[PDB]
Design a protein around this ligand. Structure first.
Ligand SMILES: CC1(C)O[C@H]2[C@@H](O1)[C@@]1(COC(C)(C)O1)O[C@@H]2CNc1nc2cc3nc(N)[nH]c(=O)c3cc2[nH]1
Ligand SMILES: CC1(C)O[C@H]2[C@@H](O1)[C@@]1(COC(C)(C)O1)O[C@@H]2CNc1nc2cc3nc(N)[nH]c(=O)c3cc2[nH]1
Ligand SMILES: [Cl-]
Ligand SMILES: [Cl-]
Ligand SMILES: [Zn+2]
Ligand SMILES: [Zn+2]
Lengths: 372, 372
């Protein structure tokens, strides 16, 4: 039987790594892309379809599930895995992004954050966030943090990061004090510090002193743009323990993922393939296309000329164009399945190229064609 | 290889019949339920899922496809079957329902009907309707008629029926004058006459004199209610040729279908399982339920306790309740798959019970439990 948590690096090229995380509910191949399932569903896909595209793990969200259908309710129903019909690992974000994005609904203190609906109130704290993730039965539990807004002054970034590090210790202690959770799930810490190298170093040092199963780079994908994100990754990822997974939260476009892997990231999640798929954007090896465009109305080619997904084996651009134009649910289903399959094929090509020592060439070839 | 069209009755009980229609693209087991796919999609289902529920044939619509994506466009793309990925028989309605339901958008004459969008204009006539159905590649072509509004005076019902019979002859001649269509598709006539026995008889006589591969009972499911619909079926179905299929257009609820089979109907179509499924209504052998109701929020049972569909094998009422409440696409997908599977299981039970000479008992047992 598999351990609670083991991360093993099978091959490396520069800062890039490929390997596996073994957990009780399955193996995660890294670098990994996690489809987002915030409402206890990866939108428009059955779990079996999510798995068929190649996903090893999906992302849920403490904040959204706390509100609907409720954490205690999901626990009474047997946990999130049973509830939604996904039996493989699930990583749950802690709510720390919503601490920032919904801050106008919040009262924040050193104890935690209370959200007021625009009228019910719901509280999150390190202890309550970890508890909710336990009630959900999450396999990878994220520490409760604050995603620092961008831009941030050095003073405010420092104050925010310092609070997040205090909350990281409280998250660690809450997780460890629940024996069933500590024995069966993993806990990841989240590095903060905005774009400032000294603050990123202080945050990494604090997280490593506490000790976690994996380390997320938080506080990015907040409007900073790719050049700046890459600059921060350049110095921030080497600060994290080498022998544990590195998770870049909320990233991203295909070229973001490639460059982040070149900088040592092992795990990703993003709403882009699902959300923009429903909005008519399809990813291809020649760049994204908007299937709504009139130029596709009689195009019999599949969405992408090489993609192995079931959508590209059967249906034309012309048909999917019609469905999306018409607002048909099947349009959302087909676009989403293709985009998630595309993302998984990207991750597979990344893993294979690192394994074979040709990832740098893959990255250059990928960019040359994607941006042609 | 299968013929263009053969209908064979394998067993009978009273007025009820069970058998098969053989066509080039497949066999249709009767009594048959046709899922509705008006926009070149059975809403929220891949064609493979439609087939997995047991459907042998689906319904398309000349009027809707004429407008979007266009009949000539579908022909240029290889036909409706290729376009949507359903390779089995498709029956297309002719537009005659929209002649009535959208009459405020129309100018009608003996030549046909012109529809004006609320600003483009689109014309339908016996000749153009048959041509569109050819361009779509429809397997069962419906004559172009007018669904008489309900209620109708005897005079207006007679005038409407008489025009429909003239249009039925024009439909027959247009179909026969297109060799590829005449050799590979079938043509059904549509009986009109509102609720009036003498007009229904005149219409049946006119259609039988022209000669069709099958005969629809038109002009029902227009607000008349079940008692009146059954009264009209009582005298109308025996007027149609016994050795050809009898198709009741737009019907209906499960108990409508059972009673219509008891009166000699072989084919049905209805938006109820798809549309009301998206709106949260699930069919069960104990009657319909509204999954949105708070009583289902923690109900771990499947939608129906006996249903063999994939939805009832995996997911709980509680999960589907959450999805529909949340407006999630997967909620529409799961409700729709279950409801279509339920309808197909109903048809299978009807076919088996007629084959075994116990359909009258099935109908009584079905009603006693469904309405308990
Ligand atoms: C609202 C929605 C769906 O969230 C997405 C997406 O839009 C959007 C809008 O701007 C883009 C960049 C395009 O991505 O930003 C979100 C993705 N960025 C992101 N997610 C994160 C999650 C995080 N969780 C925690 N606990 N802590 C963090 O520091 C953290 C940082 C993160 N950064
Ligand atoms: C607008 C929408 C989706 O069409 C459905 C459904 O709502 C709704 C609204 O009242 C109920 C009864 C509940 O069923 O009425 C429609 C189903 N009745 C029906 N469909 C027909 C199609 C027909 N086609 C032709 N060519 N000729 C006919 O005489 C004809 C008669 C029909 N009767
Ligand atoms: Cl999404
Ligand atoms: Cl529908
Ligand atoms: Zn594809
Ligand atoms: Zn079912």
């Amino acid at each position: 039987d598999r351990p609670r948590f083991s991360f093993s690096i099978a091959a490396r090229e520069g800062k890039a790594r490929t390997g596996t995380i073994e957990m009780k509910r399955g193996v995660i191949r890294t670098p990994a892309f996690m489809p987002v399932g915030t409402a206890a569903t990866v939108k428009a896909l059955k779990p079996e379809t999510v798995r068929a595209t190649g996903a090893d793990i999906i992302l849920g969200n403490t904040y959204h599930l706390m509100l609907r259908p409720g954490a205690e309710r999901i626990a009474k129903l047997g946990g999130l895995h049973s509830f939604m019909g996904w039996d493989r690992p699930i990583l749950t974000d802690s709510g720390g992004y919503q601490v920032m994005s919904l801050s106008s609904l919040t009262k924040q203190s050193e104890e935690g954050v209370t959200f007021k609906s625009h009228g019910s109130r719901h509280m999150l704290s390190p202890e309550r966030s970890i508890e909710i993730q336990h009630l959900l039965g999450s396999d990878i539990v994220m520490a409760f943090d604050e995603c620092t807004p961008y831009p941030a002054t050095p003073s405010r970034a420092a104050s925010s990061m310092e609070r997040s590090m205090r909350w990281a210790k409280r998250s660690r202690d809450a997780f460890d004090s629940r024996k069933e959770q500590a024995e069966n799930a993993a806990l990841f810490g989240i590095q903060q510090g905005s774009v400032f190298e000294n603050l990123r170093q202080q945050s990494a040092d604090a997280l490593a002193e506490i000790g976690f199963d994996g380390y997320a780079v938080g506080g990015l994908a907040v409007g900073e743009g790719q050049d700046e994100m890459f600059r921060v990754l350049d110095f921030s990822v080497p600060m994290l323990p080498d022998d544990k997974p590195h998770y870049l939260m909320g990233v991203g476009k295909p070229d973001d993922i490639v460059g982040a892997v070149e900088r040592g990231i092992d795990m990703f999640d993003c709403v882009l393939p699902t959300r923009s798929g429903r909005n008519g954007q399809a990813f291809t090896w020649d760049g994204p296309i908007n299937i709504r465009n009139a130029r596709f109305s009689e195009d019999l080619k599949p969405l992408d000329s090489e993609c192995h997904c079931a959508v590209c084996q059967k249906w034309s651009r012309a048909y999917i164009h019609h469905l999306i134009r018409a607002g048909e649910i099947l349009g959302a289903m087909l676009m989403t399945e293709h985009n998630i399959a595309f993302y998984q094929q990207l991750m597979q090509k990344i893993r294979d190229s690192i394994s074979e020592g040709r990832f740098s060439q893959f990255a250059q070839d990928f960019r040359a064609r994607y941006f042609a």
